[PDB]
Design a protein around this ligand. Sequence first.
Ligand SMILES: OC[C@H]1O[C@H](O[C@H]2[C@H](O)[C@@H](O)[C@@H](O)O[C@@H]2CO)[C@H](O)[C@@H](O)[C@@H]1O
Ligand code: 4BZ
Ligand code: NA
Ligand code: NA
Ligand code: NA
Ligand code: NA
Ligand code: NA
Length: 513
Amino acid sequence: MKIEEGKLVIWINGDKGYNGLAEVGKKFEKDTGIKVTVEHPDKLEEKFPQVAATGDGPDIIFWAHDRFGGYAQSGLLAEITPDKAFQDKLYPFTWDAVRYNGKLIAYPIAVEALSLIYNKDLLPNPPKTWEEIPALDKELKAKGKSALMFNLQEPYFTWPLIAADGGYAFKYENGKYDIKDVGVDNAGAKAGLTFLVDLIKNKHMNADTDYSIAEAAFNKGETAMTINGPWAWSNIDTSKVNYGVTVLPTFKGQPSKPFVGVLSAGINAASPNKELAKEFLENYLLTDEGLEAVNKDKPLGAVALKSYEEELAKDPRIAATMENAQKGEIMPNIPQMSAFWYAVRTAVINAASGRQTVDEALAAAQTNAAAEFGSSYWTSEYNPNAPILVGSEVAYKPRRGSADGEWIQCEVLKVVADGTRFEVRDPEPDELGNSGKVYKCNRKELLLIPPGFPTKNYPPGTKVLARYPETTTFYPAIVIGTKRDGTCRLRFDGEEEVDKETEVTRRLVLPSP
Ligand SMILES: OC[C@H]1O[C@H](O[C@H]2[C@H](O)[C@@H](O)[C@@H](O)O[C@@H]2CO)[C@H](O)[C@@H](O)[C@@H]1O
Ligand SMILES: N=C(N)c1ccc(CO)cc1
Ligand code: NA
Ligand code: NA
Ligand code: NA
Ligand code: NA
Ligand code: NA
């Protein structure tokens, strides 16, 4: 039998109520005699398909519904079978969010939408518009505070601003999303991102601000505002900050349009515990008592279960959540959402860092929003391993090339075999002295070179592969330190005598497999 049989393993993101979920798990254990294990792995959304593809992984996976169409398409999610009476318990619109190719592929849990969260003491009257934040910031800077801080590393948080004046993902036509009609590069999208970049250029925000930094700053009363979802309210409650939750600011007179997510629970198609998982989800979790346990740990938002949402509706923070939801748009769940999110993340981060102009960033995003891509077999906490698409720069290990653990900087010309194989062009001359040779390779023979300026520094001592200055070749090296600007001080283990120190751009320093 599969190692997975005879137990129930559940994965949910670390920012949500996993302890509350485990309480529901315990109630289930008492009745069934079966162990339930709740885990919250890092990079969950990408980790799931990694393990589920081998027939392993959790029996149940929790995530916003946008990822689930891709999971289902890849054959990773079982069709669920709630009867009509169970379906009646949840809002019809939540079920629509978990339908793929006409079949239900997950149980809806809760509606999530970003809201403006503000410190009432610092800012009793929050701004109605994005346009007034610059002035507000300079006033707060004079008192050692800032106006606004939110995660600039995940495009989820910047999307409401991009969409405000006309930006969109995929156009919905003829009862379906048109993957050839992408709106990430229109006048509206450009206007939104430009405003964001201008905030950074004018020292109103830092391009390096991530989730952790933004949350800490708000919860310590150092910033007047933040942009986050219901899950975050719990930590703010503990902080003692006198906060309110309200409608996001308008941009160019238009309401901000956050992408609305439906937190959903899918069943692993390879799971030998499917009926058990159904019972858990339908009869334990999706009950007033079950959702209450999770909600009390970390607020779920507007829950899909009507009976319980009736209790939560009176909450002004929930009213604010739904007001923003109403102004926003439920995300598509099509498989192209993975490429879309990669494209917009790269564009936002690159425009923020100055790696690209807004027009350059969004032009590339439009090209790659629905593009085929692969991932490198090798993963790291320091560099992403995806997407590898046409035009990506990669480090390639030739099968009969240079012997000293060296890789060549190549360009991806083609993604084939369902993203599992690549054609890459070698700028260096082959054994016949001819440069520009195209090679076919698998996922283990290449590493993704970041298309931007990585924010994550290597700790001293880290073993790396770095391009030698003036060359297009990667050599083994150790990280000695990191300059203030992020440049890596390296010691190439290459020469035969002295420990020199060579500076190399962080983008060209890769984690050794
Ligand atoms: O940023 C791109 C990202 O956005 C969404 O992920 C959200 C998630 O839905 C929230 O519940 C919370 O965990 O924050 C995430 C962003 O950091 C999409 O669901 C996801 O697919 C997408 O990659
Ligand atoms: N809790 C409610 N008010 C509720 C309303 C409507 C329905 C669907 O008829 C279920 C529940
Ligand atoms: Na994500
Ligand atoms: Na939108
Ligand atoms: Na207005
Ligand atoms: Na039953
Ligand atoms: Na090394």
